[PDB]
Coordinates of C-alpha atoms (C1' of nucleotides) in Angstrom, one line a residue:
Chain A
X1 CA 234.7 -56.6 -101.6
X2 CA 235.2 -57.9 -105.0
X3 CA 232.2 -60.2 -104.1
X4 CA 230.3 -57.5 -102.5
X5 CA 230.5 -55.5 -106.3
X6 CA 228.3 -58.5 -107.2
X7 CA 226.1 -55.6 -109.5
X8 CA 228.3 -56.1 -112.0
X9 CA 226.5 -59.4 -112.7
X10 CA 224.0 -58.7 -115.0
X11 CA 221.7 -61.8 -113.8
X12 CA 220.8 -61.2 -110.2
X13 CA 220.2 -63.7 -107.4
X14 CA 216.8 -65.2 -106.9
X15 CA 215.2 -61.4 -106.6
X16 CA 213.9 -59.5 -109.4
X17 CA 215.7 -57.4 -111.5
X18 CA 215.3 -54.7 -109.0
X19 CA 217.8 -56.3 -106.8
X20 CA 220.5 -54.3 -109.5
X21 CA 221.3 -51.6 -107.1
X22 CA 224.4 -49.1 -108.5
X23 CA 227.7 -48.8 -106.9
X24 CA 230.4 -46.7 -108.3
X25 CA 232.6 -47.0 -111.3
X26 CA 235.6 -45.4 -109.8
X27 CA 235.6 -46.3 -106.1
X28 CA 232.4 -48.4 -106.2
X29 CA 231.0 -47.0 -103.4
X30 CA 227.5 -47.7 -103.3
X31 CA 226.6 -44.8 -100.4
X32 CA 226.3 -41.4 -102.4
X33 CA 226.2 -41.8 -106.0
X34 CA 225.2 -39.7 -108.9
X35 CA 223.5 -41.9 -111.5
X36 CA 224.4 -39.3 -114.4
X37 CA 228.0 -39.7 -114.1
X38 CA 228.0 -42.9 -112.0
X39 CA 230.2 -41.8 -110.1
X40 CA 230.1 -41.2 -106.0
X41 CA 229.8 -38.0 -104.3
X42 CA 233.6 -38.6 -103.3
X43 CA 235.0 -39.4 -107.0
X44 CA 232.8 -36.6 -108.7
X45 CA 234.6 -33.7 -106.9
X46 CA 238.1 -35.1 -107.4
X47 CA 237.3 -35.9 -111.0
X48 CA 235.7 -32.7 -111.3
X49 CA 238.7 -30.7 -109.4
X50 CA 240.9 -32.1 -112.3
X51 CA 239.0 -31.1 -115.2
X52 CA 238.6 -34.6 -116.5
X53 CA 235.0 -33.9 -116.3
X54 CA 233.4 -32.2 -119.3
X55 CA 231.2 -29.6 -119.3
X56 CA 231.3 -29.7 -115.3
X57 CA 232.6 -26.4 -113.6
X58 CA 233.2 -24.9 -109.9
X59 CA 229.7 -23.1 -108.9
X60 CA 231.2 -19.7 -107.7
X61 CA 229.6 -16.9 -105.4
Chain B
X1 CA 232.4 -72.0 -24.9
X2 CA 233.2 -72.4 -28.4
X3 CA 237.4 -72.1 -28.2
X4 CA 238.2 -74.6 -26.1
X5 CA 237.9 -76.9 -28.8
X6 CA 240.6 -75.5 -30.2
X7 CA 243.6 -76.9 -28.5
X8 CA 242.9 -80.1 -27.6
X9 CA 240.3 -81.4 -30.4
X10 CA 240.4 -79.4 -33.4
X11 CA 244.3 -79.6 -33.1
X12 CA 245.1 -83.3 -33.6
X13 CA 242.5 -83.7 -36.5
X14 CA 244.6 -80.9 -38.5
X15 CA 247.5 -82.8 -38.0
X16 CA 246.9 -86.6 -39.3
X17 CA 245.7 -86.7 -42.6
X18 CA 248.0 -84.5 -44.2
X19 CA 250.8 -83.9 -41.5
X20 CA 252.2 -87.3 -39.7
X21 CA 254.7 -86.5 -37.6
X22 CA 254.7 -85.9 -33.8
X23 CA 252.3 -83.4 -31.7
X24 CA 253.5 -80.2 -30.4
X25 CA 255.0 -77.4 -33.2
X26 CA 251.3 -77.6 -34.7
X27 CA 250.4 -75.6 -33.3
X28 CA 250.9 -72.4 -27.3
X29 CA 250.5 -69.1 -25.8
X30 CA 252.8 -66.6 -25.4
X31 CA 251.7 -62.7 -25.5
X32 CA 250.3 -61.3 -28.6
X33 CA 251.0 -57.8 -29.8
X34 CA 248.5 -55.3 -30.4
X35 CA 249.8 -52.1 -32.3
X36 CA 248.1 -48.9 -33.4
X37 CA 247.3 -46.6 -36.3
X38 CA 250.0 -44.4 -36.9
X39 CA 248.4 -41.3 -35.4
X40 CA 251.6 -38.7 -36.2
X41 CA 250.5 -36.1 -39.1
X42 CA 247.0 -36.4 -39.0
X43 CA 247.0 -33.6 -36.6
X44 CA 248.1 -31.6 -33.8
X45 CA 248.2 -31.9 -30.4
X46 CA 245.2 -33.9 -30.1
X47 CA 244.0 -37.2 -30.8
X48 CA 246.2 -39.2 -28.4
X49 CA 243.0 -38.1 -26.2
X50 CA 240.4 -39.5 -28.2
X51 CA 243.0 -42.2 -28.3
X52 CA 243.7 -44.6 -25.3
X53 CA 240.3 -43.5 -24.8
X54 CA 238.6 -46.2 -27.5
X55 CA 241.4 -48.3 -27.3
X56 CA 240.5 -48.9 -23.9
X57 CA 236.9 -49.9 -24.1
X58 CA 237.2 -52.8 -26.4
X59 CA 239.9 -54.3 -24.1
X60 CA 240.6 -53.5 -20.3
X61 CA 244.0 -50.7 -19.2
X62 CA 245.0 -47.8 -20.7
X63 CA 248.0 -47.9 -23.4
X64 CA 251.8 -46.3 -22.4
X65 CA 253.3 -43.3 -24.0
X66 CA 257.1 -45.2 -24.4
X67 CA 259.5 -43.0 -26.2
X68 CA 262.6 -44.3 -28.5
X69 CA 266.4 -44.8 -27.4
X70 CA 268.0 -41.6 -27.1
X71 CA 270.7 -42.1 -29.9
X72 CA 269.9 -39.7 -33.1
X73 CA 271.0 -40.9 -36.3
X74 CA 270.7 -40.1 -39.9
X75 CA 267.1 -39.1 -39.8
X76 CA 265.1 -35.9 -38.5
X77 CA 264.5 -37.0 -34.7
X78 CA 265.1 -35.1 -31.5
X79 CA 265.6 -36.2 -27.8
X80 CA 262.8 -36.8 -26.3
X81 CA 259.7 -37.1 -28.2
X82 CA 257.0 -39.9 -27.5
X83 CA 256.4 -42.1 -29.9
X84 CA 254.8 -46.1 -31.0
X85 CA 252.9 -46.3 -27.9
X86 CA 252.6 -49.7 -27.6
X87 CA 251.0 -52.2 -24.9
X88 CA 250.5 -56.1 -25.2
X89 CA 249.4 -58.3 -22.7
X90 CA 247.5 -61.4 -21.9
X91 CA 247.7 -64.6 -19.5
X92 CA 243.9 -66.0 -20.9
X93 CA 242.4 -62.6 -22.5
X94 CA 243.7 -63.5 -25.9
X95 CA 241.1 -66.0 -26.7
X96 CA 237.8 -64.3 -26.4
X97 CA 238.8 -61.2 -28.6
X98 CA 238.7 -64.3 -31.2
X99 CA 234.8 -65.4 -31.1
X100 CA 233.3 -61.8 -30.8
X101 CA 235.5 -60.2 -33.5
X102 CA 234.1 -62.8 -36.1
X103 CA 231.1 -63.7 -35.6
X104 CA 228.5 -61.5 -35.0
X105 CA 228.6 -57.6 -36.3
X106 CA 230.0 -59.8 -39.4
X107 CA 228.5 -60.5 -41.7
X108 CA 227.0 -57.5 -40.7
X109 CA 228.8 -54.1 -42.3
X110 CA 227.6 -52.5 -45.6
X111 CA 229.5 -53.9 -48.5
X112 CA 231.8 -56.8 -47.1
X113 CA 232.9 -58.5 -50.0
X114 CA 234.1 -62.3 -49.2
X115 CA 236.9 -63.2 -51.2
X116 CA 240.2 -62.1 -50.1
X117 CA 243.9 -61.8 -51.7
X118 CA 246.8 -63.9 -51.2
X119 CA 248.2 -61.8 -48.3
X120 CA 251.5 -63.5 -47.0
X121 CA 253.9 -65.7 -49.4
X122 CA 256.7 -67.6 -47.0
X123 CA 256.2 -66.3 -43.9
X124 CA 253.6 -66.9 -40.6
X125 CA 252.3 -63.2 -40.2
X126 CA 249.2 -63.2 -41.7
X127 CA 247.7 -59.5 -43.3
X128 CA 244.7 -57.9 -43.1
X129 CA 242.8 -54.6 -45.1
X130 CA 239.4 -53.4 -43.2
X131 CA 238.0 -49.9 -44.1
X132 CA 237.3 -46.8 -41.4
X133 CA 233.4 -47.5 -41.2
X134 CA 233.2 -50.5 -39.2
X135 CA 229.8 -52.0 -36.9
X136 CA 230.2 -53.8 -33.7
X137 CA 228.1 -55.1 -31.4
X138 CA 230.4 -53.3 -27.9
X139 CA 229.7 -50.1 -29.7
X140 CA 227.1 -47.3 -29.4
X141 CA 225.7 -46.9 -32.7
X142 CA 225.3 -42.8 -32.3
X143 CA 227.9 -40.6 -29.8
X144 CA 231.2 -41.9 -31.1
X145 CA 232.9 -39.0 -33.3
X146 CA 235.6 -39.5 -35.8
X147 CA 235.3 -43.6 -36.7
X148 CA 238.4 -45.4 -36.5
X149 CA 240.0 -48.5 -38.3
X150 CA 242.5 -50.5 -36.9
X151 CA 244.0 -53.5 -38.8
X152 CA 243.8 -57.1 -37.1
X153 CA 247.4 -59.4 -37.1
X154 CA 248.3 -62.9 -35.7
X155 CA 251.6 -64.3 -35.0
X156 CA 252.4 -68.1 -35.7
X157 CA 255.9 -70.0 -35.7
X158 CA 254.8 -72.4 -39.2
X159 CA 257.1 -73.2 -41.9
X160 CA 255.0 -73.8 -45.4
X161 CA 252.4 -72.2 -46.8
X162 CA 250.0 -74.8 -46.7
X163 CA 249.5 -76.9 -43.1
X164 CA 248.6 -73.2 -42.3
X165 CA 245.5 -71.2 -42.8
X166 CA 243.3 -75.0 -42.5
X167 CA 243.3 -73.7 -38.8
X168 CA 242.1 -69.9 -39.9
X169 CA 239.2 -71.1 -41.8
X170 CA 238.2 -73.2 -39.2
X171 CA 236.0 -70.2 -37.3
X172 CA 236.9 -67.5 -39.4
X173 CA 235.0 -66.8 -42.5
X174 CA 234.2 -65.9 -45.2
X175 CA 237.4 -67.1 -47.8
X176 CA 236.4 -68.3 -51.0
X177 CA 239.0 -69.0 -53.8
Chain C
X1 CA 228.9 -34.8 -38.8
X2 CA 230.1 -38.3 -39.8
X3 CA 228.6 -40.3 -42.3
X4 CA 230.5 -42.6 -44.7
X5 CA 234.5 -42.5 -45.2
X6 CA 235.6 -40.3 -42.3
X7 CA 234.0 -36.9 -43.3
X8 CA 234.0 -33.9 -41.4
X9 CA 231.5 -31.3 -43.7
X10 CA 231.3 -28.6 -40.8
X11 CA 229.9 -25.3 -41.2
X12 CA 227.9 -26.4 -44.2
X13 CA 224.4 -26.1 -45.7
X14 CA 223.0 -29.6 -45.7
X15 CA 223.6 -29.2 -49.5
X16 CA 227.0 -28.7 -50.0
X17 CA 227.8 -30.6 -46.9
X18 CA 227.2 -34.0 -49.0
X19 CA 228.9 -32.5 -51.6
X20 CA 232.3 -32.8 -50.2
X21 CA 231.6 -36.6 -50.6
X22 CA 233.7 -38.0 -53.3
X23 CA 230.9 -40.3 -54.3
X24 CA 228.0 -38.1 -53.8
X25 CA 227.7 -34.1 -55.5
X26 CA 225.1 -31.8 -56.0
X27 CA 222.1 -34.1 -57.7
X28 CA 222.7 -36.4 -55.0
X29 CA 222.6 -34.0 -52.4
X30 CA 218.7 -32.8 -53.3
X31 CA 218.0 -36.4 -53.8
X32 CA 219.4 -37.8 -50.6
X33 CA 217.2 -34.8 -48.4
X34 CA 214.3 -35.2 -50.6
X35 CA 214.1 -39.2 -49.8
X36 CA 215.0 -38.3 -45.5
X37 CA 212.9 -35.5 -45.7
X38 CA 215.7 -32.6 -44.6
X39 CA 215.8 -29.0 -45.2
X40 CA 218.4 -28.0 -47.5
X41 CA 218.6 -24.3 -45.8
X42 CA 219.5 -26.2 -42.5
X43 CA 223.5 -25.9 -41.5
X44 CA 225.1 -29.4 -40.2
X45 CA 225.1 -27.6 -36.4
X46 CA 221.3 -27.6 -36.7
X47 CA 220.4 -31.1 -37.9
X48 CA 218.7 -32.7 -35.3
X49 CA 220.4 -36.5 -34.1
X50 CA 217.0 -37.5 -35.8
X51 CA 217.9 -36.1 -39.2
X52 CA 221.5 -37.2 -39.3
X53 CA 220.4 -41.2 -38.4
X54 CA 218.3 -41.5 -41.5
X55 CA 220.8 -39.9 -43.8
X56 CA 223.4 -42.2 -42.9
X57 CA 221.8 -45.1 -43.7
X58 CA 220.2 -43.9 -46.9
X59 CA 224.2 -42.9 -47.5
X60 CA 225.7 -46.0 -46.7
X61 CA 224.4 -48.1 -49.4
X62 CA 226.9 -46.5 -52.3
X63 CA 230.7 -47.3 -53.6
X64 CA 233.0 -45.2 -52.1
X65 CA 237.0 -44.9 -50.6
X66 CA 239.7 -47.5 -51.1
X67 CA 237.5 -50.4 -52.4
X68 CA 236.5 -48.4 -55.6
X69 CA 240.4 -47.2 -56.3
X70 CA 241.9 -50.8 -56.0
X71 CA 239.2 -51.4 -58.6
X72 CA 240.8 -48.7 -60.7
X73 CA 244.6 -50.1 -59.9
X74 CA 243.3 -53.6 -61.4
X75 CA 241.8 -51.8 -64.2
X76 CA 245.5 -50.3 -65.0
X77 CA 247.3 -53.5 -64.1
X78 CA 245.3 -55.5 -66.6
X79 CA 246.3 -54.1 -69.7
X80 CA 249.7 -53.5 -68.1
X81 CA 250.9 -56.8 -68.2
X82 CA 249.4 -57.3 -71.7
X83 CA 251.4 -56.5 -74.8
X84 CA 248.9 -52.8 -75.1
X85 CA 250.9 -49.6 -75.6
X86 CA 247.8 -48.0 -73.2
X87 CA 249.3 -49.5 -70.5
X88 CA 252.6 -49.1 -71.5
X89 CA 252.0 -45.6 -71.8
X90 CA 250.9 -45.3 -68.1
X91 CA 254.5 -46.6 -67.3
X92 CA 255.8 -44.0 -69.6
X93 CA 259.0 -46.0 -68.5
X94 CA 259.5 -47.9 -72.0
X95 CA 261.1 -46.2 -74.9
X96 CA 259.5 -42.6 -76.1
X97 CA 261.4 -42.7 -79.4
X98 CA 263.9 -44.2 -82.8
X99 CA 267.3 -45.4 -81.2
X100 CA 267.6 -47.8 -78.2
X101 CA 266.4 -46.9 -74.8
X102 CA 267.7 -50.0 -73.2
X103 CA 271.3 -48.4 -73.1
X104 CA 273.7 -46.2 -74.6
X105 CA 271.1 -43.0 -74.5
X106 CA 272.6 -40.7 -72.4
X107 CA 272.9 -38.3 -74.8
X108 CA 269.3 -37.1 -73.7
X109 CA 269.1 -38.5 -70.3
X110 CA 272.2 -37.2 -69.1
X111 CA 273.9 -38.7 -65.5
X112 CA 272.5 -42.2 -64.8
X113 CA 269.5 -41.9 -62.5
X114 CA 269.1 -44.6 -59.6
X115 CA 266.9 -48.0 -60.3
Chain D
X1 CA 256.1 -37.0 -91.7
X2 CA 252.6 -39.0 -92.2
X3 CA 250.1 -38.1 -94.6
X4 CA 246.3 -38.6 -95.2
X5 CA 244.7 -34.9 -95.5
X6 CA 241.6 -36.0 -97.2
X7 CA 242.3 -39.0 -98.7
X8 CA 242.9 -42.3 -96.9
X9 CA 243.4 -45.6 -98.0
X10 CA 240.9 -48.1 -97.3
X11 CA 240.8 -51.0 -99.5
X12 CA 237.5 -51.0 -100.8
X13 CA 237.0 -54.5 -100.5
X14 CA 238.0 -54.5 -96.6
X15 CA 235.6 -51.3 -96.6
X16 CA 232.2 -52.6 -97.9
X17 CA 231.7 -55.4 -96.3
X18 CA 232.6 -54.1 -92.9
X19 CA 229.6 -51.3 -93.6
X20 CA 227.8 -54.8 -94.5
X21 CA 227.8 -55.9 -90.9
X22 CA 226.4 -52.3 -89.9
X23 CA 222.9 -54.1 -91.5
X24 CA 222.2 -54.3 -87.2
X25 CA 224.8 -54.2 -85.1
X26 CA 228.2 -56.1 -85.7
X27 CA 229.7 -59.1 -87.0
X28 CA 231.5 -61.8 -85.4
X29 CA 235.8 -61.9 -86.8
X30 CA 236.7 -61.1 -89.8
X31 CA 239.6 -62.0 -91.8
X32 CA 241.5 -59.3 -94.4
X33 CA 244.8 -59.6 -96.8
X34 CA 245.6 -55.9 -97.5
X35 CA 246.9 -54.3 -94.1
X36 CA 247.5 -50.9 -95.8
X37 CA 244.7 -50.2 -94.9
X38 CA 243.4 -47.6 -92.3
X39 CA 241.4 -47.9 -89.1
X40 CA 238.0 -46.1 -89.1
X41 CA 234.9 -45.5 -86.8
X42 CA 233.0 -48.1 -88.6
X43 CA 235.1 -50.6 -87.7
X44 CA 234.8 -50.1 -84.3
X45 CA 233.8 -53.1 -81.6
X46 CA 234.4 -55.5 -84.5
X47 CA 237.3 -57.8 -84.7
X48 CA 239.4 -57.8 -87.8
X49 CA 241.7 -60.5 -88.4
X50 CA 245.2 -59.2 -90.1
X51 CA 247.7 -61.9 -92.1
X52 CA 250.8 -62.1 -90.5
X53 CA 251.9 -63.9 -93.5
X54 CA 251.4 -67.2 -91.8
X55 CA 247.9 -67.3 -90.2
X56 CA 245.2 -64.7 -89.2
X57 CA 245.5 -62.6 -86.0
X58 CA 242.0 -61.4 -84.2
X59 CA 243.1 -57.6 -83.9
X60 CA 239.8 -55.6 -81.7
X61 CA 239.7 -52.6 -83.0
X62 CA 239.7 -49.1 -80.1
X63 CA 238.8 -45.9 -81.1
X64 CA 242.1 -45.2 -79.1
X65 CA 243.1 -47.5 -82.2
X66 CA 241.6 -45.9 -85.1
X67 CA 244.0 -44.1 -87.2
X68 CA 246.5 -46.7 -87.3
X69 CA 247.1 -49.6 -89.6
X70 CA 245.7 -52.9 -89.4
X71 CA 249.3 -53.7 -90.2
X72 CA 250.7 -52.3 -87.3
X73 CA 249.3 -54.4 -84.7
X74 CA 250.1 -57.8 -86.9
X75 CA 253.6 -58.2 -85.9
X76 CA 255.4 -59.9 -88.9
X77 CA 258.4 -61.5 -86.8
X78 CA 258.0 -63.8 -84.0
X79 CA 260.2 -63.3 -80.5
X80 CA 259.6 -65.7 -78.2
X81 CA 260.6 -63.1 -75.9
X82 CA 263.4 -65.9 -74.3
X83 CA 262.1 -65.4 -70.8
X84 CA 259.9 -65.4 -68.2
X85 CA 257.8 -63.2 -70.4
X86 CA 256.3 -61.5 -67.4
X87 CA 253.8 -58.6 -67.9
Chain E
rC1 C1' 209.1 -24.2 -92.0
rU2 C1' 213.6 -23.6 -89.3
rC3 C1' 218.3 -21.3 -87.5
rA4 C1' 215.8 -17.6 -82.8
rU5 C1' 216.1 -17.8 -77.3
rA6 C1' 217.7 -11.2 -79.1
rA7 C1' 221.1 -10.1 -74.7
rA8 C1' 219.9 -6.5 -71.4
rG9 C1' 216.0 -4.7 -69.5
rU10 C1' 210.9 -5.5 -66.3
rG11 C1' 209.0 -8.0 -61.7
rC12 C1' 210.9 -11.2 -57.5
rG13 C1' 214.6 -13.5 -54.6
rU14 C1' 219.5 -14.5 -53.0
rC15 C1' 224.2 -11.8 -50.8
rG16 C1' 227.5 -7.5 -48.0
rU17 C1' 234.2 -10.3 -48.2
rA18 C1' 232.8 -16.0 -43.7
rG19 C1' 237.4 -19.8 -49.4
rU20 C1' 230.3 -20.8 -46.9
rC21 C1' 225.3 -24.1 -53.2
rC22 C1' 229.3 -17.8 -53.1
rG23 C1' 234.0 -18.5 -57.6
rG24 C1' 234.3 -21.8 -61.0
rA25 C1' 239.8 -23.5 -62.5
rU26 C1' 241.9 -28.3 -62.3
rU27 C1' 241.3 -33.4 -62.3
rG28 C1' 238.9 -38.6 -62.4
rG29 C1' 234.9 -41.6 -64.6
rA30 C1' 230.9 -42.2 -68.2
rG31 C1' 229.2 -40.5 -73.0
rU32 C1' 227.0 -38.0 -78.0
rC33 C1' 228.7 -35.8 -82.2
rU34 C1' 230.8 -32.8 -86.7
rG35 C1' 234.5 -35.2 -89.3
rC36 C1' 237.1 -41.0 -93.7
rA37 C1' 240.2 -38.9 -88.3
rA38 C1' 240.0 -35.6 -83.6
rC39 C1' 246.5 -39.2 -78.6
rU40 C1' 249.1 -34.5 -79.5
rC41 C1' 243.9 -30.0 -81.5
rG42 C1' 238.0 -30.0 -80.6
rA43 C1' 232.9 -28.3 -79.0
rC44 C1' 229.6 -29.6 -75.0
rU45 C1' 228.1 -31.8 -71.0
rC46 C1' 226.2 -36.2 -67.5
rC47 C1' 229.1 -37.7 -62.5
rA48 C1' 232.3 -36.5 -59.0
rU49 C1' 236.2 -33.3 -57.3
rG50 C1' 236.1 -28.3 -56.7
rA51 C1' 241.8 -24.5 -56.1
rA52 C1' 243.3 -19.6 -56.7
rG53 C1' 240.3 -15.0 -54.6
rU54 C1' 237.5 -11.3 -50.5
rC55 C1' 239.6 -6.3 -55.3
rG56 C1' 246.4 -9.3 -56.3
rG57 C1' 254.9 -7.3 -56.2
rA58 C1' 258.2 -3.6 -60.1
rA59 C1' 255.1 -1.3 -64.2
rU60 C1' 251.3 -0.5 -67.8
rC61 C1' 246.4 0.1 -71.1
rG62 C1' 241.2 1.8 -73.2
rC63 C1' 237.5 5.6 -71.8
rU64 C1' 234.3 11.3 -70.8
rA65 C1' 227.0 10.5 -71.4
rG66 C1' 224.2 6.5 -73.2
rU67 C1' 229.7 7.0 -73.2
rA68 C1' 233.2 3.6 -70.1
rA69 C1' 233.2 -1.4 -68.0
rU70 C1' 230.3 -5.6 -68.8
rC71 C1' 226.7 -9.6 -71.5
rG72 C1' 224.6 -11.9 -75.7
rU73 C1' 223.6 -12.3 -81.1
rG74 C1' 224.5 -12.0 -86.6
rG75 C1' 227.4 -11.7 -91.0
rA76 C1' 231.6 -11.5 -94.7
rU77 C1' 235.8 -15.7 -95.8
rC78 C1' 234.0 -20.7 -95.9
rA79 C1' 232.9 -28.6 -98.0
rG80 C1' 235.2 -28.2 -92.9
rA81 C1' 238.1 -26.8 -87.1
rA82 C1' 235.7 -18.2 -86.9
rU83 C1' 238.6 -17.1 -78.4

RNA sequence: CUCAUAAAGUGCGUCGUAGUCCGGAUUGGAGUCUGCAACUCGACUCCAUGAAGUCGGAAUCGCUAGUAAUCGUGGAUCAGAAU
């Protein structure tokens, strides 16, 4: 939920920074992400199907 | 013993604080019918044997083989082929058949559960709904093949619902709601 | 030989014989002889009046026959008279489509059918 | 013609918090807005409530009930069903 | 390190046609999972049920020595459903 993406606030609760977890930019899913892109394992294959991705390709076989 | 009570003591209490009228019609004695487990299908010519012949240890005679009124109509039926059986009788019999049947050997089955359905809705017959494995005390516990299950009815002349069935659970139990 | 609701397992290893019960099957069957004590090579023509008493008794004490099914009638009679599609899909009576059902179909049914 | 292949719609706010309550066990009812959403595993035991557009119903979610909508087991309209409104 | 147990063989026992634990279909109940999902489309199996058969109408197909028939396993394609 839009409270649940509570991340996004900068000052966390009364834990230490290290309460800042992650959670996705594009579907904010929190699960599988992949902190170089910041994106989750589910938004980095549809971003990367449609090219928007740079440098990012297909591995082949 | 215990059912003489019941016809000139336990008759006139059931009938003043939540009757008031007159004596009689609340409940008399007149015959009451016995009938039997349909035995066609099951098998072949057989069982009427094993028939008549358990049917007549619980109770004393042996039942009649009556046949229907020779008039076929618009089902399959020949001329001439036995079937109901049937034989009901009494005098002063009906009465003890009502103190052994539940009392002892009950509770004293297997699984008997304790509450039972609304059987009847605006009538007198009663119902009834006992399985095939049954234990009684006028029964050998080990020579008797093929158990049988007969149901149990009772015929009364009442007119409501309620007035009724206070006289059931009055020595016949268990009923809970 | 007879043991709960009105069997008749003749000609049977005292295996198999049980299985024939619809509450009881093969793991109960080795169970049930290993508790009495039976062989399981023995037919039911064999077993003793001994061997039969105990196995009865050992049987009796399970849910089986018409008490168990009326369970399973209430089960379907439950969510039957609630608003669940489950249970109307057991009636399979209500409407299968997208028109009307009710009347004026026909078309599909054909001749009116009896009520 | 219905269509999901490999992409349904679950509100993501509806979503995360129901994964929330997977923490140990379930959650008592919930309440959600968005009935375009989809039933899933996950939410299964728990009771989501769905607006009717007037007040909340407690819908228990079935896995013979996952697939479905949320929406589809609010019903918008109200019929008092003039009648006995047996079974 | 794992997928792996290779299946068969080898040794032993059961059985010889009685629907008999032989044969396992079908069906009821419970239940795990791969999968964002599996009512229609799943795999597998706990629990129970347990038929058709004792080599099956008119016709018709593959095969000749380790071959036929029969049993099990692996791989290519492949995120993932490969009788």
């Amino acid at each position: 939920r839009w409270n649940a993406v509570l991340k996004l606030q900068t000052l966390p609760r009364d834990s230490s920074p290290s309460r800042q977890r992650n959670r996705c930019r594009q579907t904010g899913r929190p699960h599988g992400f992949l902190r170089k892109f910041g994106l989750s394992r589910i938004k980095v294959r549809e971003a990367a199907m449609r090219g928007e991705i740079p440098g990012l390709k297909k591995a082949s076989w | 013993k215990l059912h003489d009570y019941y016809k000139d003591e336990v008759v006139k209490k059931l009938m003043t604080e939540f009757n008031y009228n007159s004596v009689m019609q609340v409940p008399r004695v007149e015959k009451i019918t016995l009938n039997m487990g349909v035995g066609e299908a099951i098998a072949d010519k057989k069982l009427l044997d094993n028939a008549a012949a358990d049917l007549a240890a619980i109770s004393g005679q042996k039942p009649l083989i009556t046949k229907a009124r020779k008039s076929v109509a618009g089902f399959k039926i020949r001329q001439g082929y036995p079937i109901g059986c049937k034989v009901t009788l009494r005098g002063e019999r009906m009465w003890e058949f009502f103190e052994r049947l539940i009392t002892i050997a009950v509770p004293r089955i297997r699984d008997f559960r304790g509450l039972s359905a609304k059987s009847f809705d605006g009538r007198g017959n009663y119902s009834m709904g006992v399985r095939e494995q049954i234990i009684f005390p006028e029964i050998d516990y080990d020579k008797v093949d093929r158990v049988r299950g007969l149901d149990i009815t009772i015929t009364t002349t009442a007119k409501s619902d309620e007035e009724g069935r206070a006289l059931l659970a009055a020595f016949d139990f268990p009923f809970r709601k | 030989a007879r043991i709960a609701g009105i069997n008749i397992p003749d000609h049977k290893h005292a295996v198999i014989a049980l299985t024939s019960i619809y509450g009881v099957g093969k793991t109960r069957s080795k169970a049930i002889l290993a508790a009495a004590g039976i062989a399981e090579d023995v037919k039911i023509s064999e077993l003793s009046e001994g061997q039969i008493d105990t196995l009865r008794d050992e049987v009796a004490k399970f849910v089986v026959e018409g008490d168990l099914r009326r369970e399973i009638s209430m089960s379907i009679k439950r969510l039957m008279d609630l608003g669940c599609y489950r249970g109307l899909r057991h009636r399979r009576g209500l409407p299968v489509r997208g028109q009307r059902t009710k009347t004026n179909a026909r078309t599909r049914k054909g001749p009116r059918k009896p009520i | 013609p219905r269509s999901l292949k490999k992409g349904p719609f679950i509100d993501l706010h509806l979503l995360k918090k129901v994964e929330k309550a997977v923490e140990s066990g379930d959650k008592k009812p919930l309440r959600t807005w968005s009935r375009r959403s989809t039933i899933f595993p996950n939410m299964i035991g728990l009771t989501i409530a769905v607006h009717n557009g007037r007040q909340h119903v407690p819908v228990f979610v079935t896995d013979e009930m996952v697939g479905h909508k949320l929406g589809e087991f609010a019903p918008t309209r109200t019929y008092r069903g003039h009648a006995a409104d047996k079974k």
